[PDB]
Amino acid sequence: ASAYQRFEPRAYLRNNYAPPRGDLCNPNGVGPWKLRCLAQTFATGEVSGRTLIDIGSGPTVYQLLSACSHFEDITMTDFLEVNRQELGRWLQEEPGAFNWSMYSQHACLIEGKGECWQDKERQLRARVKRVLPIDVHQPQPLGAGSPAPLPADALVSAFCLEAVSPDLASFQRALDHITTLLRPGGHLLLIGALEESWYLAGEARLTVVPVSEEEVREALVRSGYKVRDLRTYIMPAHLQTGVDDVKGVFFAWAQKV
């Protein structure tokens, strides 16, 4: 955990969201695949409501592009100060913010509702109300009196749990914890690394609990969810850049029953 004190946002974004893993031109890339999972899920029109929380958002916004048009009150979160500060730079359009234009464009492309990418970012920024600190390890992740409207109508978390858990049991608990933030009948979109044990974030060297699709499925169940969908993306050879040892990426659509 203390390892996350040396976690550099810019280095993290450069290792995962800049070429080649960030190139969105090739359909078979992880970028295109990921945005497509989110887009298709929301297009079914079943994941809906008023509020939505992004667990461990880190310095990224992609995971909310297709979502934002379905929830008016979006709450973003993250353990690290530096990460909330990097999100702010992009939300306020301040100088030195990360450039997600390519992602917005592609999300607009995938959705195919003829929307320009500027209207997409404008809507996301508009709907994101707050950027709160969080710790999935605490039984009440956000705290006692959190500004965030609870319980949420849906949850979204990408590459957080398994990246902050030392073993399978912590992973399981952290999932039990965030599930308390979700309203019964609510929806969870969990995205993560498959069979990953480490990944670099600049000077930081984060340890990870390698998990499998089945271990993830079982976990979602043990936490009272009905797995609506679960897909896998096997990391290609040319996307093995040395910044980690991820084997694949998983996408899960679970509904709290």
Ligand SMILES: Nc1ncnc2c1ncn2[C@@H]1O[C@H](CSCC[C@H](N)C(=O)O)[C@@H](O)[C@H]1O
């Ligand atoms: N105990 C904890 N509870 C919640 N988030 C935590 C945490 N410890 C670390 N984190 C955060 O979890 C994130 C994992 S990296 C994933 C970032 C982003 N969700 C993406 O899709 O790329 C980091 O931003 C890290 O600061």
Ligand SMILES: O=S(=O)(Nc1ccc(Cl)cc1)c1ccc2c(c1)CNCC2
């Ligand atoms: O899928 S990724 O290669 N990049 C990527 C994801 C999604 C899109 Cl839309 C584009 C690119 C990736 C993102 C985060 C993490 C890791 C890998 C492994 N380390 C833990 C964190």
